[PDB]
Write a protein that binds this ligand. Structure first.
Ligand SMILES: Cc1cc2nc3c(=O)[nH]c(=O)nc-3n(C[C@H](O)[C@H](O)[C@H](O)COP(=O)(O)OP(=O)(O)OC[C@H]3O[C@@H](n4cnc5c(N)ncnc54)[C@H](O)[C@@H]3O)c2cc1C
Ligand SMILES: Cc1cc2nc3c(=O)[nH]c(=O)nc-3n(C[C@H](O)[C@H](O)[C@H](O)COP(=O)(O)OP(=O)(O)OC[C@H]3O[C@@H](n4cnc5c(N)ncnc54)[C@H](O)[C@@H]3O)c2cc1C
Ligand SMILES: C[C@H](N)c1ccccc1
Ligand SMILES: C[C@H](N)c1ccccc1
Lengths: 341, 339
């Protein structure tokens, strides 16, 4: 097979690795390439806060819950490994804060040590009356992309700077199988009105004393439209906006203020933190992830496309389960052609 | 009333602040001075790992448990304050690891969210079979001393870099009350054969990805003679030796190795951590803290000494309850003098 993966964000690179690992040994002429028009540090993935945590409500497609779980167990299994930090991975503990009682999240047993906050814990965060504590994992987008591209490179997977104009051009360039991991821009290659940009702005800050994630929720204003603080490997991400439908890629002043003042209110020690950068990214928001096979005809030959996009504000959290599912669908492509695992 | 506090480590400065904050308003004149022969960054306190956690067995003296508790409640209540990190203070969560089941510690309800580790959690730590999780606080010795000295200075408490040769000399120089916070060197001013150095060596490392404390225990080799990892504000402290009776203030090779290999085995990501410094300090080990009043008699008057030393490897953990108790004893002194 000639396989072209389109996209070098978390979804693209994880999928490319997962396919290569699973099928290199049984399919000798396996030729896997990555095409993309943005690589680290210039992908949405690089701008991600870095935390493993699904949305608070159950997803429309319950398969997503398994993909999240598989991703956690996968990442957890590297803790104890000498290279966990080089992969962008380290354990972190933290708080989820609410202005009123809410049900437990579906993921409460996936994380480690989930429990309700006690009154003394609530005293640390005055504006809030209810919440959770748990241990989870940091997965830093930037570092993980760098790890994946090294792992891919060693396995002979080749990377190409290419702005793909259509699936047609890639098929006629020889690809038997196209894996579509184009994130929020997938609509360019095939219209998909269910896919919308989730505009998130963040402030990165030097405040190494903060060891815990702190995520506040506002049930009325929707997910991640409430202050959040996430310690990274070297810096801390401050957030608080996540606006669907907004394609403006420039930082604005009003969101900066919302983030800074919301987070300084949550964590007043931030007064002494040095601003290191400010960024805006677009979460690929969709009612559910698109992860499915599609057959396209160009001339007399069929081309196989597998889509993997629309992971909203949880791409890091879910990526590995999705990569595994794409590999499963790839297996079926092979078996449809009398090829064997 | 001239009060000379001897010592500028955590014990000395906390005590001086507590006395001054308690009596400045009601006693004129009150003159509080600090004498010491080392200030930050040169005290044992500056070398401390930074974590709030008492020893695993309860203390002989039941007052010590309360002092620990008062210290936790004091420090916790600064979380929310804009200056907590400038004080050297931040919350941390972490793991206490054992090769076998042990009883719960007496302090289990003082910390936040104490529980046993689950089977899943234990897999993260291949070498260990049982443990605890809880949330506590980092109190960085260095930063806390800088904070206390600023708070003291602003309130007009004066410092003097001075080696005290005897209590007598300080009394004769005009002190009505001496607070003895000389840590492991208290024996120089008054022999105390119960007081021994607890020699601890540590390695400081840049490994900012480590967000949790990890403390292992070896029931066979004694407290803190087993690998420990404690994230500080800017650096991580790696430890694993604590020998009573050893007065060598120089780093040695064996302890470096014990610490590095123990901790690299616990936390193999340490392979990429840059060494920042290696240090040795002396914990003031005593069967129990000495915190008591004593009357001395030189010249034409009595001078009151209040001792506050012998806090072993838990001086940061216990300091504030001790400072409070000394301020109380000071109150008694004042009333006996009809102030
Ligand atoms: C501020 C913010 C914080 C977030 N924090 C988190 C978090 O803490 N945890 C979490 O799980 N998720 C988080 N997310 C969610 C989100 O899913 C991730 O950011 C994720 O990066 C999306 O992955 P992706 O690979 O599909 O897209 P991207 O990372 O955007 O990568 C897409 C790739 O496709 C390429 N591409 C697209 N179109 C073409 C074309 N026509 N030709 C060639 N190449 C093309 C791009 O160049 C790029 O290489 C966050 C999102 C935002 C905005
Ligand atoms: C490696 C290590 C790690 C530790 N980690 C922790 C931890 O994580 N948590 C915790 O709670 N505890 C910890 N401890 C214990 C803690 O460091 C000590 O209990 C504490 O610092 C002792 O405080 P101190 O003020 O009594 O002594 P010091 O900080 O040693 O202060 C002694 C002071 O007295 C002065 N002085 C002495 N004699 C004279 C004299 N004759 N004239 C003038 N000045 C004099 C000195 O100059 C100095 O100012 C640790 C100890 C060590 C060695
Ligand atoms: C951390 C959380 N996944 C997030 C999502 C969108 C924008 C900011 C933060
Ligand atoms: C963390 C603990 N208090 C400790 C004591 C002595 C040496 C290292 C660590």
């Amino acid at each position: 097979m000639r396989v072209v993966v389109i996209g070098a964000g978390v979804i693209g690179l994880s999928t490319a690795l997962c396919i290569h690992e699973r099928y290199h040994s049984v399919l000798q002429p396996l030729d896997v390439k990555v095409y993309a028009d943005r690589f680290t540090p210039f992908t949405t993935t690089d701008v991600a806060a870095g935390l493993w945590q699904p949305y608070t409500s159950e997803p429309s497609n319950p398969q997503e819950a398994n993909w999240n779980q598989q991703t956690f167990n996968y990442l957890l299994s590297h803790i104890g490994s000498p290279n966990a930090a080089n992969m962008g991975l380290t354990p972190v503990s933290g708080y989820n804060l609410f202005r009123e009682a809410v049900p437990d999240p579906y993921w409460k047993d996936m994380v480690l040590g989930f429990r309700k906050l006690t009154p003394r814990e609530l005293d640390m965060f005055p504006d809030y009356r209810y919440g959770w504590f748990n241990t989870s994992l940091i997965l830093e987008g930037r570092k993980y992309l760098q790890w994946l591209t090294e792992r891919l490179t060693e396995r002979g997977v080749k990377f190409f700077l290419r702005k793909v104009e259509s699936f047609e051009e890639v098929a006629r360039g020889g690809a038997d199988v196209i894996i579509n991991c184009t994130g929020v821009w997938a609509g360019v290659l095939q219209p998909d009105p269910l896919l919308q940009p989730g505009r998130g702005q963040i402030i990165k800050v030097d405040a190494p004393w903060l060891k815990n994630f702190i995520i506040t929720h506002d049930l009325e204003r929707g997910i991640y439209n409430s202050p959040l603080i996430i310690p990274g490997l070297q810096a801390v991400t401050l957030g608080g906006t996540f606006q669907v439908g907004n394609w403006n890629e420039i930082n604005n002043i009003q969101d900066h203020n919302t983030i800074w003042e919301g987070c300084c209110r949550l964590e007043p020690t931030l007064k002494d933190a040095k601003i290191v950068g400010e960024y805006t990214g677009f979460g690929p928001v969709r009612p559910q992830v698109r992860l499915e096979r599609e057959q396209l005809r160009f001339g007399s030959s069929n081309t196989e496309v597998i889509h993997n996009y629309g992971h909203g504000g949880y791409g890091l959290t879910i990526h590995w389960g999705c990569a595994l599912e794409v590999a499963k669908l790839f297996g079926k492509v092979l078996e449809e052609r009398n090829l064997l695992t």
